[PDB]
Amino acid sequence: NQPYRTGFHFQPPKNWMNDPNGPMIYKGIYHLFYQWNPKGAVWGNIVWAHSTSTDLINWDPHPPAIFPSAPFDINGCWSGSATILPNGKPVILYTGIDPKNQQVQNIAEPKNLSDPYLREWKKSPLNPLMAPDAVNGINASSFRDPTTAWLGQDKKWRVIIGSKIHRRGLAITYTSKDFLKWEKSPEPLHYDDGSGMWECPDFFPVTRFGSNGVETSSFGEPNEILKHVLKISLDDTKHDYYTIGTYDRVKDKFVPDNGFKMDGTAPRYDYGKYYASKTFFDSAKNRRILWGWTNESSSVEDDVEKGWSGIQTIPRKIWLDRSGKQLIQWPVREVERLRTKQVKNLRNKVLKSGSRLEVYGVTAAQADVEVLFKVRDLEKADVIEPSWTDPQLICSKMNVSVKSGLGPFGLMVLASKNLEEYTSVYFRIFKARQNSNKYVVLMCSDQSRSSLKEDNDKTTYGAFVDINPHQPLSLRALIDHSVVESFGGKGRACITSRVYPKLAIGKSSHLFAFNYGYQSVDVLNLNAWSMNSAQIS
Ligand SMILES: *[C@H]1O[C@H](CO)[C@@H](O[C@H]2O[C@H](CO)[C@@H](O[C@@H]3O[C@H](CO[C@@H]4O[C@H](CO)[C@@H](O)[C@H](O[C@@H]5O[C@H](CO)[C@@H](O)[C@H](O)[C@@H]5O)[C@@H]4O)[C@@H](O)[C@H](O[C@H]4O[C@H](CO)[C@@H](O)[C@H](O)[C@@H]4O[C@H]4O[C@H](CO)[C@@H](O)[C@H](O)[C@@H]4O)[C@@H]3O)[C@H](O)[C@H]2NC(C)=O)[C@H](O)[C@H]1NC(C)=O
Ligand SMILES: *[C@H]1O[C@H](CO)[C@@H](O[C@@H]2O[C@H](CO)[C@@H](O)[C@H](O)[C@H]2NC(C)=O)[C@H](O)[C@H]1NC(C)=O
């Protein structure tokens, strides 16, 4: 009936869903809002749907919180963010479409602050608070997605909205003392020529050393160094990127660290299907949670047919890695509460060149797997080409059928009995240079053989993994019928993909560990956890 609906990923009972909106925590209750189409499996009639949770895994339904009802949002209620004011009151800033189809920024607040589920929201008659006009010269067609705001040292609030002027991406900053009267700043928080429109911006602090999250307005301390992350969704490429840097509060400008540029060359949170991501500070457990939208890789016809489209990945905790050059991600630990009591284990299994090992006793279509690979004699690894810089193209030109010294070796998920269908998540090791001791670790998510149906988008994804092959390579994959979330090197590389196998469905799906490389690899350990379905909206 619905072979591709997920058992533990967030998604509405039906219809189209896109950007996650106003993620927040209030009175111990997690809130998730999201762009939803009340009457279609394609984008349209967009409103802010609403759901609440106490563990970020199980979600309870609620009526749409924000939907067209006034001139300032008559043609649509687009994405936005929630900010928790000092007095503990949560407010929402969202982009609305006015009568002339112009994008404007409106504020919304709860009607009953005593309601922990914040079911009803009211919209200020002062809206819009920020709008495109002849005075500011902002592009009325490219001015959207207000972020969560942060309080400045001068007690004035700051907020940025995604925009652009021609080909220059912009993070337009506004300031306010009362959160009502907002003044456009002369200079943007940041920009970049050639990137194109900047959507779903995000700006937050991260601790230099540690995995704990940091309140969005927190200032740097002489003994507490804080870095700042600027994240934007590039409309031109459909990918989410981020850069690590410092915050010049004097000029009110973001300053990327050396080797960082806010554009298509910056790092991504996820190298597969992932967009419009947004974080929020979970003051309940001192962590920053990242929400990300993953659209369908199936045809629109299939979408209309199944009656829905779009899911959110499993929320994940994010923090700065020790090197300080990238962020690390890991699904919230609460998802582990879905793992079956009895886990399937496999230790010290030597995978010989061209061999594969099947993992029995687990619902291969809805599980969580974590493997530890131990390579043998790295000197045997091929020397990567000097010019190769695109991980995706390497995975594309050197697919699973192409052998090498070390790899392809990893996992075959959502696979059929006789591998007629399968999604391959693996590693491939290259030697930095001839006789060198430095190695390049590549992570691939190949869906070229994921389904017999050809209308599905089987694009292959790839990403480099900042880990040393001399130590066991870590790999994790969350399998959920039509979505696979792969984590390499304990979250140093993430790849989300959507597949729709015609055979590898439900009970007929299988899980395999494999090694098609010339040099055999050793599977130190492997844990497969059947995942129980969650109660979601
Ligand atoms: C959610 O919605 C969809 C996901 O469903 C997503 O939209 C895009 O997803 C992919 C990007 O991740 C796009 O994938 C590309 O597909 C091309 C292949 O298409 C197939 O073959 C024909 C096209 O050549 C055609 O029969 C069909 O596709 C149609 O093509 C026309 C183009 O005229 C297009 O307008 C239509 O929309 C159709 O897509 C077939 O399905 C393919 O060329 C692309 O692959 C190249 O690039 C990838 C990296 O992105 C790389 O891995 C490959 O190796 C390949 O590389 C080429 O260039 C190299 C040079 O560097 C060469 O060396 C090499 O030989 C190759 O020539 C790519 O896979 C997909 O088209 C697109 N889908 C649609 C309909 O928009 C959204 O992004 C997503 N939304 C959000 C917000 O997340
Ligand atoms: C801002 O408004 C829209 C934002 O999309 C821009 O219109 C696009 O312009 C490009 C050229 O760079 C065309 O290829 C697209 O077809 C246009 N699409 C739309 C929305 O019509 C517009 O150019 C921008 N204006 C300025 C000066 O920033």
Ligand SMILES: *[C@@H]1O[C@H](CO)[C@@H](O)[C@H](O)[C@H]1NC(C)=O
């Ligand atoms: C406000 O919300 C609380 C909690 O849901 C509820 O007990 C109370 O009756 C509500 N007050 C009204 C009538 O708005």
